[PDB]
Amino acid sequence: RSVARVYANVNEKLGRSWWDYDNLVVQWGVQDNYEIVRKVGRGKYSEVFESIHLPTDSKCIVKVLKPVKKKKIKREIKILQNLAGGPNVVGLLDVVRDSQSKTPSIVTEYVNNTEFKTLYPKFSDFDVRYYIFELLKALDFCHSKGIMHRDVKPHNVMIDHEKRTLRLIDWGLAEFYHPGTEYNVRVASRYFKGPELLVDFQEYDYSLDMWSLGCMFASMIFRKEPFFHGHDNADQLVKIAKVLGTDELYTYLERYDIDLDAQFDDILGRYPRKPWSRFVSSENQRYISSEAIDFLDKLLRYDHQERLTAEEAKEHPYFEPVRQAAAQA
Ligand SMILES: O=C(O)c1ccc2c(c1)nc(Nc1cccc(Cl)c1)c1ccncc12
């Protein structure tokens, strides 16, 4: 049915040794070369600890993984190996496991993040352009390697504001794109879920990540976190519909032959498109420009095939100051 409009054939060209994570053989490192110092975070899927690589006395992260499905371990490790050297992708340092339990751990680089709720309001207009551009380099890189992140959100984007460095982290939901594959629609955080996930459209692609980027960008320039605040998955679609409008939703549904679940009959009304300018306020207007609105408009589309590619997104006039400043060094 639907096929990605860029990078559709990447996994075809690279072959089984790139994407066949089921047959991954890990060359496990020495667990005793690492010392766990302090827990920094817990996920649904993991626990993250500040650690030391003892031989070099260097600071690093140990991410202990306990998913009920083992192939999710292999998938995360294969993608992290494949993205080696990628710009702004979190660096894999090692993979180790407990000798008795066989519980695996991923070792990554440590990043001194400032939490996004503190960090995002301190950004200038230029900072938003700059960090979105850096995030675009990581998404263009993984898409060009046949990989969808599927969990793009502020929590998975680590920024060292002092060093002006960015890392896209937590590749645990990431997956290889294979033309015509039916993917699980139970991916991403509710506020960052694309319409395709909300209406059970399974033939999605890299363009899912561009919707999620659009939700992050909206929250940064309008200072509303999260931008689409649904109380549940059905409500998430209503919140989107109350901004993009029900007219563009219905042609999209017709275009991809999607039938809405009967649950939407009572809760989904007819809404006109709310123009982007209505979200402009005294507090957020320092982020706002016609280039910014134009950029956001071209990310937040129902139709995944209408959204900018990460590569098109880097060519947008919004990033002209960032491209100019980079050209000065
Ligand atoms: O998943 C990864 O690849 C992943 C990779 C690197 C980090 C991480 C998650 N989580 C961090 N912190 C964090 C903060 C709150 C909750 C959770 Cl679970 C974790 C963190 C901190 C400093 N440097 C690197 C990381």
Residue numbers in the entry: 5 to 333
Cite, word for word, the article reporting this structure.
CK2 is a heterotetrameric enzyme comprised of two catalytic subunits (CK2α) and a central dimer of regulatory subunits (CK2β). Amongst these kinases, C. neoformans possess a single CK2α orthologue, Cka1, which is orthologous to both the Cka1 and Cka2 catalytic α-subunits found in S. cerevisiae. Furthermore, it was reported that disruption of CKA1 severely perturbs the production of two major virulence factors (melanin and capsule) and attenuates the pathogenicity of C. neoformans. The structures present a classic fold that is a characteristic feature of protein kinases, composing of an N-terminal region filled with several β-sheets and a critical αC helix, as well as a C-terminal region that consists primarily of α-helices.
To gain an insight into the binding affinity between cnCka1 and CX-4945 for the development of selective anti-fungal drugs, the near full-length structure of cnCka1 in complex with CX-4945 (excluding residues 1–4 and residues 334–338 which are not visible in the electron density map) was subsequently solved and refined to 2.09 Å. Similar to the AMPPNP-Mg2+ bound structure, CX-4945 binds at the hydrophobic catalytic cleft and interacts with the residues mostly through hydrophobic interactions. Additionally, hydrogen bonds are formed between Lys67 and CX-4945, as well as the backbones of Val115 and Asp174 with CX-4945, and an electrostatic interaction is formed between the backbone of Arg46 with the chloride atom of CX-4945. In general, due to the ring structures of the CX-4945 molecule, the inhibitor bound complex contains more hydrophobic interactions as compared to the AMPPNP-Mg2+ bound structure. Our results indicate that CX-4945 binds to cnCka1 at a binding affinity about twelve times lower than hsCK2α. In contrast, CX-4945 IC50 for cnCka1 was 77.44 µM, indicating that CX-4945 IC50 for hsCK2α was ~60,000-fold lower than that for cnCka1. However, in the cnCka1-CX-4945 structure, the corresponding residue His159 does not interact with CX-4945 as it adopts a position where it flips away from the inhibitor. On the other hand, in the human structure, Arg47 does not contribute to any protein-inhibitor interaction, while in cnCka1-CX-4945, the backbone of Arg46 interacts with the chlorine atom of the drug through an electrostatic interaction. In contrast, in the cnCka1-CX-4945 structure, the hydrophobic interaction between the corresponding Thr112 residue and the inhibitor is weaker due to the lack of ring structure in the residue. However, in the current study, we have observed that unlike hsCK2α, cnCka1 has a small residue (Thr112) at the “gatekeeper residue” position.
